[PDB]
Amino acid sequence: MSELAASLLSRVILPRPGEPLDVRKLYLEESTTNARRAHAPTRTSLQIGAESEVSFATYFNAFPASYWRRWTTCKSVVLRVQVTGAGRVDVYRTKATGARIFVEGHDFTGTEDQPAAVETEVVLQPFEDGGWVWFDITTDTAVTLHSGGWYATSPAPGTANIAVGIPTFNRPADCVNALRELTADPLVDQVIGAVIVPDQGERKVRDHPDFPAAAARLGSRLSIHDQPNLGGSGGYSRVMYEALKNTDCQQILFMDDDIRLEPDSILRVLAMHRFAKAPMLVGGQMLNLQEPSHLHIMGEVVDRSIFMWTAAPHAEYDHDFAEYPLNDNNSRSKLLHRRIDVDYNGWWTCMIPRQVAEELGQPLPLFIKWDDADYGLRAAEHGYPTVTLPGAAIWHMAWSDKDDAIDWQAYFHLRNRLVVAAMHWDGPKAQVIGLVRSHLKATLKHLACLEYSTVAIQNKAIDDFLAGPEHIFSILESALPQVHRIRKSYPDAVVLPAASELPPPLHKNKAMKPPVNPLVIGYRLARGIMHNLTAANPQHHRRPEFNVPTQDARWFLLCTVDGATVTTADGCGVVYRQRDRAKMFALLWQSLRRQRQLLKRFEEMRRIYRDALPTLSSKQKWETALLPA
């Protein structure tokens, strides 16, 4: 009956026609011994040739059993498939080591008229610290898999009523696409109660030629709110503000505009939220929009030793499922079988229970960065954990090539790290030395790389954090322009269209091998210190010594030049980096001056920042930024 529909956790899904073979690996893994490729006539069905084997040990179709055991009331899961033809459904699970274990097989024989139903209940008891469940089909005669699903044994609790939030800024076409994809799958459509779009740009999504068609499918569920550029924080703050005040939605789902969606991902997230033992945040993972078979990360934490976000303990960035199948002996694939606990999830997909939003308050008024991490740490302090759910994903731009933490974002990275550190530290007193040491090493590296503007804006970052939580809030919007203004006067921050716009380099490039050798690193380091003590030659600021590609722009090469072009990470331009011994020393001294301030004033900072949390997170205070005159 529809008792099936109410207990559906995760549908077995298949690729769209014309899907590149790499991406198909996220869905199904076919034996190379098969006569022909399996064919997907719809997104929920599959035709398999006679005498063929297909494995559903895959990102989208395997069941992340250990996560369900850890966070939900589901004691068991039921696999249900409908099949025609003759063959066997084999059910497997893994230990947290990745070791595969055969659970049970079921021979079937069905026809189009009388299709076979194959059911398998798997208890979730043996998944304490990792493991997946999946099935394979090995055929006798040609087989059609008409449908498949992972089901709970009882209906989902609560009511499904999601407010989806999508902040957008000068990407009307991406936003229109996102709105369109939300209503593509009828089952996702039915559970969406509202779509809040804080439009923070000048190029409005409302003015896009395809907007009316996307807007029609949502009807009055859609609202667009014009506001100034308040970054991610202001965007998602608005979303949460609107959801609590102007809707009765039980779940708040943060999403993003520049995404591609696998709609079942939303239902998986929702299912985990509904079956949850206690209220919690449920997050989706990010697949790399530019390398679509690659998983960005299983989950992330905040490392408390230096208060810095990182990969969770047994997780590694950029896992290509086409090269490294889930069910494979290699070391990268085995890591995927551990249950990865997280401190927070990113806001490309993050479900927040209504009550939880109410109790915790709004995002901190940081512009970009650390706002998601803060909201995870805050939630945990209130006994609301976060789970990053494997197999529930969207496609989003990763820092795949195109990004570098040396531009204006570096200001926000440092400032907000400090704000959130002050807000959540809890650890011993002398623990801040770790964070400052971390920053010193990075500072000397920037100076070695001639990334002078970076250091300057990081000096402003420290000043702004030190000025307190009231100054932070007052510069929600003004902070960005002020960072640009500082950067304009540094040659290392002025992007030119091409190296060919400048005089041709004095020297041709020579391939320099990266020093792994212990003695050689020392030698390159000393050579760098020695050069940095000399007065720079001004002629190398008129004509660059080298044109350095991004991939070659490393400290060991850069710490011996007086002047060079360095290509930006996105490959779109170059900057003329220039050494000046007087400026370097001055920036270094200003940095050290600030480092000593941080470790002197950090305890005070914790007090004032924790005392300001009611204010920084109140809907009323946020109204002063969100709403105009």
Work out which of 421, 450, 574, 625 binds a second copy, going by CB under 8 A: 574
Which of positions 227-286 make contact with Mn ion (CB under 5 A)?
Answer: 256, 258
Q: Is 318 in the site for Mn ion (CB under 5 A)?
A: no
Work out which of 2, 114, 190, 551 binds a second copy, going by CB under 8 A: 551
- Which listed option, Mn ion, a second copy, none, makes contact with residue 400 (CB within 5 to 8 Å by class)? a second copy
Q: Is 105 in the site for a second copy (CB under 8 A)?
A: yes
475 three-class SS: coil
Q: Is 184 in the site for a second copy (CB under 8 A)?
A: no
83 three-class SS: strand
Q: Does 328 count as an annotated binding residue?
A: no
Q: Is 117 in the site for a second copy (CB under 8 A)?
A: no
Torsion of CA 209, 215, 216, 217, to 10 degrees: 120
Residue among 136, 257, 264, 372 flagged as catalytic: 372
Could you tell me the smallest distance in angstroms from the CB atom of residue 160 to a second copy? Answer: 26
Long-range contacts of 463-471 (CB under 8 A, 24+ apart): 463/594, 464/415, 465/414, 465/415, 465/418, 465/419, 465/422, 465/605, 466/597, 466/598, 466/601, 466/605, 468/605, 468/608, 468/609, 468/612, 469/419, 469/608, 469/609, 469/612, 469/615, 469/616, 470/612
Q: Which residues on adjacent β-strands are paired with residue 387?
A: 282
Could you tell me the smallest distance in angstroms from the CB atom of residue 349 to Mn ion? Answer: 11
Q: Does 362 count as an annotated binding residue?
A: no
**Which tokens is 152 given?**
């709970």
Could you tell me the smallest distance in angstroms from the CB atom of residue 559 to a second copy? Answer: 20
Closer Cβ to a second copy, 331 or 534, answer by number: 331
Total interface residues for Mn ion by CB under 5 A: 2
Closer Cβ to Mn ion, 269 or 336, answer by number: 269
Which of positions 17-36 make contact with a second copy (CB under 8 A)?
Answer: 17-21, 30-33, 35-36
Q: Does 330 count as an annotated binding residue?
A: no
Q: Is 173 in the site for Mn ion (CB under 5 A)?
A: no
Cβ(583)–Cβ(450) under 8 Å?
no
226 three-class SS: strand
Closer Cβ to a second copy, 547 or 617, answer by number: 547
- Which listed option, a second copy, Mn ion, none, makes contact with residue 256 (CB within 5 to 8 Å by class)? Mn ion
Which of positions 13-52 make contact with Mn ion (CB under 5 A)?
Answer: none
Which of positions 311-340 make contact with a second copy (CB under 8 A)?
Answer: 313-314, 338
- Using alpha carbons, select from 170, 59, 613 the residue that is nearest to residue 359: 613
Q: Does 258 count as an annotated binding residue?
A: yes
- Which listed option, Mn ion, a second copy, none, makes contact with residue 258 (CB within 5 to 8 Å by class)? Mn ion
Work out which of 79, 96, 360, 422 binds a second copy, going by CB under 8 A: 96
Query: Residue 372 catalytic?
Result: yes
58 three-class SS: coil
Question: Taking contact as CB under 8 A, which single stretch among the options 48-56, 177-185, 349-357, 612-620 is the one that binds a second copy?
Answer: 48-56
How far, in Å, CA of 485 to CA of 336, rounded? 45
Q: Is 140 in the site for a second copy (CB under 8 A)?
A: yes
DSSP letters for 255-280: E-SSEEE-THHHHHHHHHHHHBSS--
Work out which of 6, 43, 51, 595 binds a second copy, going by CB under 8 A: 51
Close Cβ partners of 263 (under 8 Å, ≥ 6 residues apart): 181, 182, 184, 185, 187, 188
Site string (245-264) toward a second copy, x via CB under 8 A: --------------------
Q: Is 111 in the site for a second copy (CB under 8 A)?
A: no
418 three-class SS: helix
Could you tell me the smallest distance in angstroms from the CB atom of residue 323 to a second copy? Answer: 9
Work out which of 43, 95, 171, 531 binds a second copy, going by CB under 8 A: 95
How far, in Å, CA of 471 to CA of 474, rounded? 5
Which of positions 482-541 make contact with a second copy (CB under 8 A)?
Answer: 498-500, 508-511
Work out which of 5, 101, 467, 526 binds a second copy, going by CB under 8 A: 101
Q: Which amino acid is at 17?
A: P
Cβ(141)–Cβ(83) under 8 Å?
no
Question: Taking contact as CB under 8 A, which single stretch among the options 94-102, 197-205, 371-379, 591-599 is the one that binds a second copy?
Answer: 94-102
Q: How many whole angstroms from its chain centre is CA 166?
A: 15
Q: Is 571 in the site for a second copy (CB under 8 A)?
A: yes
CB-CB neighbours of 383 under 10 Å: 9
H or E segment at 424?
A: helix 409-424
Q: Which residues on adjacent β-strands are paired with residue 137?
A: 54, 89
Q: Is 371 in the site for Mn ion (CB under 5 A)?
A: no
CB-CB neighbours of 105 under 10 Å: 15
Site residues (CB under 5 A) for Mn ion? 256, 258
Question: Active-site positions?
Answer: 372
Binding site for UDP-alpha-D-galactofuranose: what residues are annotated?
A: 171, 200, 229, 256
